[PDB]
């Protein structure tokens, strides 16, 4: 089986992406976030504190002749921005792009926080890292994809974002339209959970290449490019007026410049990130600040190839015994 779905981007810079999804009998569809750095699928729903809820779809198990409650389970979540949800457990019926699941752990909300309130567009999150980082307690749940995988032709899915546009994950196939030239595939480390992976350097615009092992993790949750201070420094020393603000939180350039693309290394190959992608617009409503779309990883703890890194390149996520993951131009 294969299943093939258009994500839509949220806003008109790219914040995040959300990807219909088919839930419960007759089907109830929301529009979830894909995550390849979290685990677990939870949904809006009718057990949603309503105060809490602000234009959201809610998914509604007993509208679901297939829903069942997973007695006894719970969850709770925190993200890397500090953002955070928790509630109950149901087994259901669960689509995307045509292929099913049956059985899959969809997770209720009792509570979200502000951050997910205030976004009407994202009924919930569907996780694409490793089974290990799902947080159902007492018995730990299974991804969509690894509930899909022995369904599945071949045991991938690809991640094929667009900037300021529609595009496309794919489950159990490779297009091999939907990329130029060839993939090149890299080592993951699955010991923290993540789809994580080691770039082998990068340049800032048409500077050289700096060879230098970047260890990160590919988030398709996560809006921009996380990199070391080292790293990020080199890059906005090279736009006119750039400068790391602790009152906005990050690095801010003048919306004036024209930013120079960043490329990093696969292996051998390159992939180039152009300069457009990296502007996140007025820091606030008519500034003339804007905000950059690299930062700096310190105090995250880890490195990340968010989706200002992933729309750049056609990804394939690689869930065989031994997992890998492939880049290619497009």
């Not at 105090?299 to 869930?319: C, E, P, Q, T």
Request: net charge negative.
């Amino acid at each position: 089986s294969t299943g093939s779905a258009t994500t839509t981007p949220i806003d008109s810079l790219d914040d995040a992406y959300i990807t219909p999804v088919q839930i419960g009998t007759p089907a109830q569809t929301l529009n979830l976030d894909f995550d390849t750095g979290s685990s677990d699928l939870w949904v809006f729903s009718s057990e949603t504190t309503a105060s809490e809820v602000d234009g959201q779809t809610i998914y509604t198990p007993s509208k679901s002749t297939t829903a069942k409650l997973l007695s006894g389970a719970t969850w709770s979540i925190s993200y890397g921005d500090g953002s955070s949800s928790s509630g109950d457990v149901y087994t259901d019926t669960v689509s995307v792009g045509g292929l099913t699941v049956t059985g899959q752990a969809v997770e209720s909300a009792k509570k979200v926080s502000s951050s997910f309130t205030e976004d009407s567009t994202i009924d919930g999150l569907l996780g694409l890292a490793f089974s290990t980082l799902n947080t159902v307690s007492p018995t730990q749940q299974k991804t969509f994809f690894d509930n899909a995988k022995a369904s599945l032709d071949s045991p991938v899915f690809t991640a094929d974002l667009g900037y300021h546009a529609p595009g496309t994950y794919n489950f159990g196939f490779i297009d091999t339209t939907a990329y130029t030239g060839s993939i090149t595939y890299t080592a993951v480390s699955t010991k923290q959970g993540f789809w994580e992976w080691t770039s082998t350097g990068y340049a800032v615009g048409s500077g050289t290449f700096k060879s230098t092992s970047i260890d990160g993790i590919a988030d398709t949750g996560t809006t921009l490019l996380y990199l070391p201070a080292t790293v990020v420094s080199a890059y906005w020393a090279q736009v006119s007026g750039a400068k790391s603000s602790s009152s906005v939180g990050g690095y801010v350039f003048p919306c004036s410049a024209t930013l120079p693309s960043f490329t990093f290394g696969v292996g051998s190959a390159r992939i180039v990130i152009p300069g457009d992608y990296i502007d996140f617009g007025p820091i606030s409503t008519g500034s003339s600040s804007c905000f950059g779309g690299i930062q700096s990883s310190a105090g995250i703890g880890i490195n990340i190839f968010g989706d200002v890194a992933l729309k750049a390149a056609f990804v394939v996520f690689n869930g065989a015994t031994t997992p890998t993951l492939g880049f290619a131009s497009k």
